[PDB]
Amino acid sequence: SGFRKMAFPSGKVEGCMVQVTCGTTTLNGLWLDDVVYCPRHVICTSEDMLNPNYEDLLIRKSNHNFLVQAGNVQLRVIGHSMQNCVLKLKVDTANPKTPKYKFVRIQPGQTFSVLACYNGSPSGVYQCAMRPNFTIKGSFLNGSCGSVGFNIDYDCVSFCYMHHMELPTGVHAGTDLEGNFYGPFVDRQTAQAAGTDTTITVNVLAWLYAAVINGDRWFLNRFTTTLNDFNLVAMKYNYEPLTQDHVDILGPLSAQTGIAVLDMCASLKELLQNGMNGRTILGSALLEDEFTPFDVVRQCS
Amino acid sequence: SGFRKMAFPSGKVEGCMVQVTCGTTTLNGLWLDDVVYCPRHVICTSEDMLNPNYEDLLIRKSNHNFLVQAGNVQLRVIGHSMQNCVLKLKVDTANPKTPKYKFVRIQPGQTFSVLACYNGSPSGVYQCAMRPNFTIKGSFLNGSCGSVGFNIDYDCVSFCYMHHMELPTGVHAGTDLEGNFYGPFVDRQTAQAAGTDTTITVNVLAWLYAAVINGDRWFLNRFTTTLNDFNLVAMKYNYEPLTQDHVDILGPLSAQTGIAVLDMCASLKELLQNGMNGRTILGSALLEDEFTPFDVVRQCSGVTFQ
Ligand SMILES: O=C1CCC(=O)N1c1cc(Cl)cc(Cl)c1
Ligand SMILES: [Cl-]
Ligand SMILES: [Cl-]
Ligand code: NA
């Protein structure tokens, strides 16, 4: 028993992290087979930050302008290309530590682990979720660009995020590993602001099911709700709408606990109305929304 | 910016995890140099576990009664012995992935990363504090015994915890890597309870400093206090005593933020006596006590472990 925000073990990703230097800029790269992936903004100068023309900046570069260091070893760059907002540096060594892997673009509400890195060396691992407004609430300092987010299925690493920038509210924006940003953001220093963020309803419900599995029932009630009445209430608290997809997704946890999905929705409605009245749920005094239904089943079994 | 509960990168420890089977029991072992460490209770049947005589149970065992698999390779056990509550299985092959390491025993209030494992295979990593009542609020299912806890310092892994059991309240008990339990627990299937827990005061203060570093300042106030006055408040609220060493340890953060420790103590006094009044700190409505002063400095400075 117990319930913790738990990340995937990071070793398979650690063995892929390298340092990429261009000019006076150093950040992190992800080395898989013979390619190093990193944010294309590594080629920006201090003049290039508002309206960089990346095509024009890249055509001016030679392979030897990119310094790639893996541990204490310099890799040889033998080719380069840009794919959306990521740079792909072809190197003359396949990484012998390359795991089984895939690139996956995720949807808001999905969770993943982040291996924060600086100078090609991993610092820490934590769990994050893609917010409804396509940001993540990360922990990243200068130099962390190119750190990645991932899940592990069996022994297969699914890379879903590459870190590019911090927005003015202190939240973080980035791309998938094909270089497409999550959300409406661009790799320019022009003013950009995240949308107002909302709570990931389906994840809160998942986490309430986790609480019941771990033996806590105090927040349940004798009521139920229609799906539409639930959404009408929950949106008044800045909760994302709950769709029938989400209701279906919660089927397994509902079956395991014996609490119907819309019955749990009624519990959530009451919690939003009442607060916790000095109680806690799984050690929290707030409703937690960065555990998915899949996470809950994986951790509680 | 941002502040997250953060574990050490777990790769160096992943390369050490193996599967240990004895009879019908499978759990995890730690393979370092040519020795595999795991809980001595692996040798018990359920009858045994009621009142085990471990020396007696072990005499019966041959090396070949211990099936150790590293990945999909079997390890040959060539000797076996106990140290306190850990079994040490001498194997015929040194682990080629052994990291630089030490065995250290931590103190209550100190944090560490747990690599949760099942059948020798790492499944998850998370950060824990050794509670004042010597339990940890972990997340472990059947099969997790032998999972370990650790810190990293430079390139050296300091192993500090091996998981042994779950208590009736759902918190967790285990040993250091020399097999000495944290807390007043025994490796026997009985009646045991965690003592009443308290809050780790120095860590709450550390986390308040983290909040300030991250722009969350509403709880700051113009007041300061004394150790003795604050410690009376702490005792009243089931908070650990704050000592002068704690104050010294927080010195760096006091210098960096402009908030003396006793100035922050007055913030904490007011939070305890009045609550948060609908507000949050670093996204929490509870006062978080599982970040040490060192953790806050490390995360708000970007220290790495290549
Ligand atoms: O087996 C153990 C070791 C730790 C501990 O407290 N137990 C335990 C727990 C419950 Cl709930 C019931 C019983 Cl008989 C024993
Ligand atoms: Cl997804
Ligand atoms: Cl909370
Ligand atoms: Na003050």
Curated annotation (Swiss-Prot), chain A:
Cytoplasmic side: 1-301
Catalytic activity annotation: TSAVLQ-|-SGFRK-NH2 and SGVTFQ-|-GKFKK the two peptides corresponding to the two self-cleavage sites of the SARS 3C-like proteinase are the two most reactive peptide substrates. The enzyme exhibits a strong preference for substrates containing Gln at P1 position and Leu at P2 position
Positions bearing the Glycyl lysine isopeptide (Lys-Gly) (interchain with G-Cter in ubiquitin) cross-link: K5, K90
Superkingdom of origin: Viruses
Active site, UniProt feature: H41, C145
Impact after mutating K90R: In strain: Beta/B.1.351
Subcellular location: Host cytoplasm; Host Golgi apparatus; Host nucleus
Effect seen on changing N142A: Does not affect ability to cleave and inactivate human TRMT1
Recorded consequence of changing L205V: In strain: Zeta/P.2
Activity regulation as described: Inhibited by pyridone-containing alpha-ketoamides compounds 13a and 13b. In turn, alpha-ketoamide 13b (tert-butyl (1-((S)-1-(((S)-4-(benzylamino)-3,4-dioxo-1-((S)-2-oxopyrrolidin-3-yl)butan-2-yl)amino)-3-cyclopropyl-1-oxopropan-2-yl)-2-oxo-1,2-dihydropyridin-3-yl)carbamate) inhibits SARS-CoV-2 replication in human lung cells. Inhibited ex vivo by michael acceptor inhibitor N3. Inhibited ex vivo by compound 11a and 11b.
Domain Peptidase C30: 1-301
Subunit architecture: 3CL-PRO exists as monomer and homodimer. Only the homodimer shows catalytic activity. Interacts with host FBXO22; this interaction promotes the proteasomal degradation of nsp5.
Protein function: Cleaves the C-terminus of replicase polyprotein at 11 sites. Recognizes substrates containing the core sequence [ILMVF]-Q-|-[SGACN]. Cleaves and inactivates human TRMT1, preventing tRNA guanine(26)-dimethylation of tRNAs. May cleave human NLRP1 in lung epithelial cells, thereby activating the NLRP1 inflammasome pathway. May cleave human GSDMD, triggering alternative GSDME-mediated epithelial cell death upon activation of the NLRP1 inflammasome, which may enhance the release interleukins 1B, 6, 16 and 18. Also able to bind an ADP-ribose-1''-phosphate (ADRP).
Protein name, UniProt field: 3C-like proteinase nsp5
Name of the gene: rep
Shown segment, full-protein numbering: 3264 to 3564 of 7096
